[PDB]
Amino acid sequence: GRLMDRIRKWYYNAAGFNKYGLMRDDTLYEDDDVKEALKRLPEDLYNERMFRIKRALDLSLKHRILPKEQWVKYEEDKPYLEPYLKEVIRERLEREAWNKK
């Protein structure tokens, strides 16, 4: 329901990665699944993620953040990887299930 649909927007702003100009998916810990997903991203999406991340690291070393104008807005955050990652995991679960059978 549209209840926690607000909570999310709240958490999203509490987290604060948007202050670094990062997308939610940019902050994912790169375990195995995530690593595979990243290999599937189209070139353009991949390079954009790369610049965003490098940009964030540079801000982090400088101990600064992006001007308020440049912060990613909750509703404009692109879940660019979630689709691929969801697929990668099903495939894995398929194989896992099949190899027990």
């Binding site: 495939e91 398929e94 099949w98």
Partner: protein, 420 residues
């Protein structure tokens, strides 16, 4: 058990052949009119990559399930193809047909050609092509078709180098959407009941009607492509435009073929019934080989001879093969030679169907470029019904027609098309 060979032809033009020989194993296949023939300078090699792409994920089954699934029931899945026909078939024990069928269905009608899978697959073209070319035999045929034609058929059967890695998921999809159409496909199937194979073709074969992309006419060039590569052995092939599939002049060439000699019948034996072999034999002294070459395509064909010989003797060997062709065009054909051949041809034909693969191929080939099954007695009737004159004429057509030649090896002593 022993009877029939039904063959329906659904609404959309999708032909279904079928024969129950009660074999403990089945072998279903999807024949299609498609190949490097419909390729354009723009999408060269896409047919080849498609061939290697059979195991990639589909809309109904995943790359993983396709392989594990088929293997679980001791089945097999393969794709054979020529410049103008692609066959996707699967084999397995009778009790698993329904299981193996799902993947065959999925592969040919529901590929996804996911970009990544496709990107990882492409370097395979380099490998696949590397083993094939281990046979000099293959290199010259590629060049032959490129010298014999200006288009369509001139297109190579193996993805050219410069294009490895450049084919796209688009091109694959587009190639499939414009060629794998019900009016260009036939669902043949040995070891099964016609009703079953038909109920399948219906409720499941989606990609309906159409004829999509039409191949450009096969223009004849008549070129000569030579390849100096050092090999102690020179492979040469000289041909001329010949008969097309189902052409009246076809049966004629096929016979002139055996008369000239096409393949040994006795292990390590000499071929006396081969005028061509025998002729060359009297010409050279060292090891060699020579045969009657004959290909019949939809809108064209090639005919001539193919020779393998030591470099220094390619000259004498090729001339010899020629003199033997002219000598035949000038009535150098006994009424008996025509008799012997006719038998070797009928025998060869009949033996070439004992194979589950051989039979399915024969059946499906007709059901695709026809829609009917010429009885064996009929094909026999058509073969011997070839006069001694027809044969001498075929030979004439060669001596007169514009020749195209393809050779490779240490061509230092190999003659040029204009010196024969």
């Amino acid at each position: 058990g022993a009877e029939d060979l039904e063959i329906t032809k659904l609404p959309n033009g999708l032909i279904i052949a079928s024969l129950e020989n009660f074999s403990p194993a089945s072998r279903i296949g999807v024949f299609i009119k498609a190949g490097s023939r419909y390729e354009t300078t723009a999408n060269l090699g896409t047919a080849h990559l498609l061939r290697l792409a059979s195991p990639l994920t589909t809309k109904g089954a995943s790359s993983f399930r396709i392989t594990r699934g088929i293997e679980a029931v001791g089945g097999s899945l393969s794709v054979y193809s020529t410049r103008e026909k692609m066959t996707y078939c699967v084999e397995c024990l009778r009790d698993h047909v329904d299981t193996v069928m799902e993947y065959l269905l999925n592969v040919t009608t529901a590929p996804e050609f996911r970009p990544w899978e496709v990107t990882d697959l492409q370097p395979q073209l380099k490998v696949d092509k590397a083993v094939a070319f281990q046979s000099p035999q293959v290199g010259v045929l590629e060049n032959l078709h490129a010298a014999a034609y200006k288009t369509a058929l001139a297109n190579p059967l193996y993805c050219p180098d410069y294009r490895i890695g450049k084919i796209t998921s688009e091109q694959l999809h587009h190639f499939v959407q414009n060629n794998f159409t019900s009016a260009r496909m036939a669902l043949v199937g040995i070891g099964v009941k016609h009703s079953d194979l038909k109920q399948v073709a219906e409720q499941f074969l989606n990609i309906r009607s159409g004829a999509g992309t039409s191949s450009a006419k096969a223009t004849y060039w008549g070129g000569e492509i030579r390849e100096q590569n050092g090999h102690s052995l020179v492979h040469a092939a000289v041909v001329t435009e010949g008969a097309a599939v189902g052409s009246a002049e076809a049966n004629a060439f096929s016979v002139l073929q055996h008369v000239l000699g096409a393949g040994p019948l006795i292990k390590r034996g000499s071929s006396v019934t081969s005028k061509l072999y025998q002729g060359v034999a009297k010409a050279t002294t060292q090891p060699f080989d020579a045969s009657a070459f004959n290909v019949n395509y939809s809108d064209s064909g090639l005919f001539g001879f193919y020779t393998i010989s030591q470099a220094a003797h390619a000259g004498e060997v090729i001339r010899a093969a020629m003199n033997q062709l002219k000598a035949a065009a000038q009535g150098g054909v006994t009424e008996e030679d025509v008799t012997k051949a006719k038998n070797q041809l009928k025998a060869t034909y009949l033996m070439s169907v004992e194979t589950a693969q051989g039979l399915l191929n024969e059946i499906g080939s007709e059901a695709l470029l026809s829609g009917t099954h010429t009885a064996p007695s009929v094909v026999a009737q058509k073969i011997d019904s070839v006069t001694s004159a027809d044969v001498v004429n075929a030979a004439k057509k060669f001596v007169s027609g514009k020749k195209s030649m393809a050779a490779s090896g240490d061509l230092g002593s190999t003659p040029f098309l204009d010196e024969l």
